[PDB]
């Protein structure tokens with residue numbers, strides 16, 4: 001319906017400028033033809049074109065063959081995090097600009113997000129340290145309450161996101177810190193774990209804190225798909241950890257889930273809510289999964305393993321995600337947090353940072369991961385606000401003085417997956433005819449249709465063909481530093 | 492022997508204070524009779540290589556962890572231990588008064604210090620420089636008629652290297668690594684950023700770069716300095732990254748393979764410096780074993796590669812077994828060497844004076860290296876100022892010695908003593924041997940045998956709890972000891 005209005009900030013590519021009255025959007029083929037969406041460094045943003053599916057092919061050029069019978073994981077979804085910082089920045093825009101921001105992420109005319117991660121009280125992307133139960137030694141949680149950050153910022157924006165979304169949206173909840181009076185160190189940050197031992201008053205109180213949070217969100221007519229056991233439990237084992245954390249060893253996590261959180265959640269009105277373990281760097285795999293899941297008192301309560309990554313780094317996937325799947329094939333892997341920046345926090349129009357997102361989503365999908373969740377939905381041009389100045393990049397940058405927001409390349413690299421891979425999509429095989437500089441992945445929608453995403457991280461154009469046995473050959477080019485999503489009918 | 496004079500700066504342990512007239516030192520070590528051992532102890536509480544002796548007895552009183560020497564299980568031979576004579580380290584050492592300079596160099600290189608026998612020497616400028624020179628900055632000089640050493644070499648590095656070799660009883664091995672070529676050999680025409688050599692292996696750019704290594708070896712030879720080895724390029728992967736902030740030169744594994752086969756190997760072999768070894772990679776271990784597969788499976792490259800150099804910085808991204816272990820399995824006659832064994836959590840300063848944690852990180856990494864076939868370690872900067880400098884970009888790292896120019900003093904960090912628990916007591920030619928733990932335990936430990944057959948065992952306790960310990964030598968008996976919380980021990984004994 002409306003195209004990108006580009007702006008340069010002097011980096012490798014352009015942002016798309018939106019305001020109170022204008023934002024780029026889509027308005028949404030027949031058997032024998034394919035659809036192709038293209039985004040390029042040079043400035044194209046999800047441009048739609050169609051080609052013919054050709055019955056024959058000849059050449060010594062690169063070929064990718066769909067293996068429609070080699071089935072892997074089914075996709076849960078894509079989304080990002082409604083942090084205090086994200087909600088603050090969105091609600092500082094004028095109401096119509098807010099509506100266009102939420103539409104970009106959550107409407108069929110935008111990129112189809114069906115995941116929202118919600119912090120349980122404060123994190124580094126907050127303007128203060130609070131928990132829901134700051135009255136010291138309140139073991140019965142009689143002073144448990146949602147502050148304005150939930151009731152005036154996060155909850156209303158979540159309601160507006162679900163209203164714009166036609167797809168059902170899944171809410172994921174993760175705590176950073178407990179109340180300080182439940183912690184060995186009496187602080188929201190630093191090295192510190194729950195007081196006492198699993199099964200005791202501290203552990204049972206913390207488990208009930210999860211049920212109170214779910215009760216309070218339900219009073220506001222929101223229901224959760226899943227909670228994590230703790231955000232980055234490894235962090236609160238580190239002396240001087242600068243922001244909100246709660247330390248667990250894998251053994252403590254195991255014992256906490258087995259003795260306290262599993263049973264407490266199971267006996268509650270919120271028993272359908274799933275529990276995810278780890279919620280931390282994938283380098284902790286497979287050891288953390290072995291400790292927790294080889295104990296059936298804990299394993300009967302764990303639905304999945306949540307993984308984090310910092311996209312400037314490259315670590316092996318098979319050794320971590322691969323081995324974990326092999327040991328625990330019925331325990332879904334789910335990517336719950338990723339980001340880039342700290343090099344400058346915000347790099348408006350950075351094409352490299354877009355390639356980091358799509359490269360990471362393809363790696364993840366090739367090694368059994370069912371979903372992929374961005375960090376902050378929106379930040380300011382500084383990459384905040386953040387009470388410890390731990391500034392990072394975000395796919396959407398809000399410029400409050402201009403009532404303007406910028407959609408970065410990261411937004412479009414995300415969208416090339418989230419818009420075209422609905423919940424239920426199943427990854428299928430795709431074999432390269434020769435070594436190549438392309439990342440690619442193929443999935444089939446519930447209805448039967450095909451989606452393939454191709455990223456070229458080289459500067460060279462790569463001619464290639466995609467073979468699907470049931471229809472023929474898709475003849476195409478991958479321009480250097482391009483990302484394409486291909487769609488086609490099969491029956 | 493003069494003891495440590497301790498000073499606290501508010502961190503977990505103390506530094507040892509040295510100045511123009513006083514530095515802590517040892518007597519020459521002295522092996523007791525069969526039936527007796529020597530133990531050197533350093534603790535977070537403040538002990539700094541304190542010597543005691545005790546019995547190895549035929550009766551086993553201990554009921555806890557037993558570590559059994561297995562001298563017939565033989566692994567790698569050690570090349571040695573050292574650090575880097577960067578521009579920053581030379582400037583820091585030389586801003587002390589001469590007598591203080593001599594005590595700093597003795598700390599590292601004398602038999603009364605910690606017996607370093609390797610120095611890494613940058614080929615012109617790096618981040619630990621106060622400017623961005625190469626040895627051939629005049630462009631279009633393909634025969635390098637204008638190659639020359641600046642002040643940094645002729646006035647700072649070379650005299651300090653001469654003085655280190657004069658202090659050491661041990662023969663010292665020199666290792667050289669370039670960061671960038673002259674910018675007129677580069678695709679990007681800059682010292683940093685995304686930039687490889689112009690053109691392709693075999694061509695005049697690649698021949699000129701290979702000739703630069705010989706010109707460098709020739710120039711140091713004129714100053715009566717010879718090299719054990721050079722690396723093919725410092726962190727070749729850096730130069731493939733957009734915006735890489737300091738001196739680099741990009742090679743893919745394939746370009747490194749072809750540069751070695753066509754240019755660097757043949758040029759070194761056809762020179763008077765043909766005895767100098769060549770190490771490949773000089774980069775993060777997460778790049779193994781792939782980098783080794785690409786280079787070493789081409790016989791025209793492999794004939795010229797003596798070893799694989801690895802850097803510690805991003806060790807947290809890939810485990811030792813999958814990288815060092817797999818590389819040894821696939822290429823068991825190509826030695827592994829740690830060429831840049833350095834540190835800093837984003838929320839901490841570059842320099843923490845008296846950090847026990849940073850010391851434990853060094854000894855923990857040396858033990859893991861030794862258990863995965865590594866033969867040698869070069870630390871980074873030999874000395875830095877209290878800001879972690881000078882560095883023309885950014886101070887991300889600490890150093891075992893911190894120089895306070897304004898007080899003519901220097902500070903020996905915990906790192907210095909954690910290194911020394913190895914470097915002092917494991918001479919060149921020492922061989923790692925078996926050491927079997929009787930049960931699961933929290934200690935890190937390694938056993939080696941000296942050339943003369945005497946035993947050395949290092950035990951690190953990164954836990955807060957004291958651990959009762961017996962060590963068994965089948966030829967001698969039982970050593971009853973304790974590994975105190977936050978301690979490191981080196982044990983030495985004759986076996987006959």
Ligand SMILES: *[C@@H]1O[C@H](CO)[C@@H](O[C@@H]2O[C@H](CO)[C@@H](O)[C@H](O)[C@H]2NC(C)=O)[C@H](O)[C@H]1NC(C)=O
Nearest residue numbers: 002005006017018019020021022023402403404
């Ligand atoms: C919001 O952005 C839109 C699109 O860039 C602006 O609409 C443009 O207005 C300019 C005036 O300089 C015209 O040149 C264009 O013809 C308009 N384009 C479209 C598609 O309408 C709008 O002016 C911006 N709003 C504010 C308040 O600055």
Ligand SMILES: *[C@@H]1O[C@H](CO)[C@@H](O[C@@H]2O[C@H](CO)[C@@H](O)[C@H](O)[C@H]2NC(C)=O)[C@H](O)[C@H]1NC(C)=O
Nearest residue numbers: 493494496508509510511512513514898899900
């Ligand atoms: C270097 O430090 C040493 C030891 O810290 C100094 O020696 C001490 O000096 C005081 C006088 O201020 C004497 O009372 C002590 O007996 C000395 N200690 C020892 C162990 O000798 C030394 O003077 C300093 N050198 C310089 C040149 O300042």
Ligand SMILES: *[C@@H]1O[C@H](CO)[C@@H](O)[C@H](O)[C@H]1NC(C)=O
Nearest residue numbers: 134135136138142143144145
């Ligand atoms: C805790 O709850 C009591 C009443 O149940 C209330 O009067 C008091 O103000 C509360 N404390 C805080 C800090 O809100």
